[PDB]
Every structure is written in structure tokens, then in C-alpha cells.
Amino acid sequence: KVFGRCELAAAMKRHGLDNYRGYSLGNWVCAAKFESNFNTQATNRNTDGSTDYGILQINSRWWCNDGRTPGSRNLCNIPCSALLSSDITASVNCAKKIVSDGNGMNAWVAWRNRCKGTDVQAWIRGCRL
């Protein structure tokens, strides 16, 4: 599923990511935009053999199990396939644990390089929320 901008903002608010650990909804939409282009089925392979999955592009090195990342962990305790669902609850609950792990949203390189320090509010401007 490829979400629209206001459509995703709304789902993320329902699941509780608005202001979670201090990050407003605009940071999360902005991050999804550049991580996946709002496509829940996005996948990308990392040089070390790990793979990033779903709308927030969560990494198998640490957070989910795909059976093909030697030595990795599965801290969210889910198959990476569940991060590809048209329902975003698995991606949202794993993101919650990730952003609380010490470094905040700096765990998403793209948030760091393309959203951090920008008018993120413009990503929810206009939306019936």
C-alpha cells in the first residue's frame, strides 16, 4: 500500500506517534516520505547483508528476523515480513522501541540528513486531523 500524505499522518496519530518521545507528527511523516515514499512494501539491501523494511525501513541487523542476517538480533520480536503489511501497527510499535533506545530519531539517517532542522510542520499542513 502507498499512503497519501494526510492519510498516513492520520494513521500514525491514531497509533500514538504524535509527540512520542517529543517528536511531532511532522517528523514521522517526513521520515516516511524519504525512507519509503509512503510505500509499506519498500525493501532495501544494506552492504553488510541486512535489509530495511516497510514505511520506516526498519533494519534486520537489530530489530526483526528475516532468517538471512547472520549474528543479528530481533528486538521487536517480529518477522520482517510483518513490517510490509498495509496495516502499520507493527512498524509503529517497533519504531517506538527504536526511538526510545538513546539516540532518538537520529537512528534514521534520512531523518538526520533530510528532516532534522527543517519546517517539518509543512508535512501535515492542511490535513483533517
Positions touching Cl ion (CB under 5 A) are 24, 26, 110, 113, 121
User: CB-based contacts of 32: which residues, under 8 Å, 6+ apart?
Assistant: 3, 8, 12, 38, 55, 56
Catalytic residue among 7, 18, 52, 119: 52
Work out how close the CB of 52 gets to Cl ion at its nearest, in angstroms, rounded to a whole number.
12
Eight-state DSSP code of residue 14: H
Backbone angles phi, psi at 55, to 5 degrees: -70, -25
Sign of the CA dihedral running 5, 97, 103, 40: negative
Residues 10 and 129 sit within 8 Å (Cβ to Cβ): yes
Active site residue 52: yes
101 is in an annotated binding site: yes
Q: Is 48 a catalytic residue?
A: no
Q: For residues 58 and 90, which CB has a smaller minimum distance to Cl ion in the complex?
A: 58
Question: In the complex, what is the shortest distance from the CB of residue 3 to Cl ion, in angstroms, rounded to a whole number?
Answer: 17
* Cβ 78 to Cl ion shortest distance, Å: 25
Report CA-CA distances (Å) from 53 to 99, 116, 121, 122, 127.
Answer: 16, 22, 25, 25, 26
Q: Which is nearer to Cl ion, 43 or 65 (CB)?
A: 43
Of residues 7, 18, 35, 66, which has the active-site annotation? 35
- In the bound state with Cl ion, the residue whose beta carbon lies nearer, of 75 and 129, is 129
Bind-site residues: 101
Q: Which residues are known to be catalytic?
A: 35, 52
Bind-site residues for substrate: 101
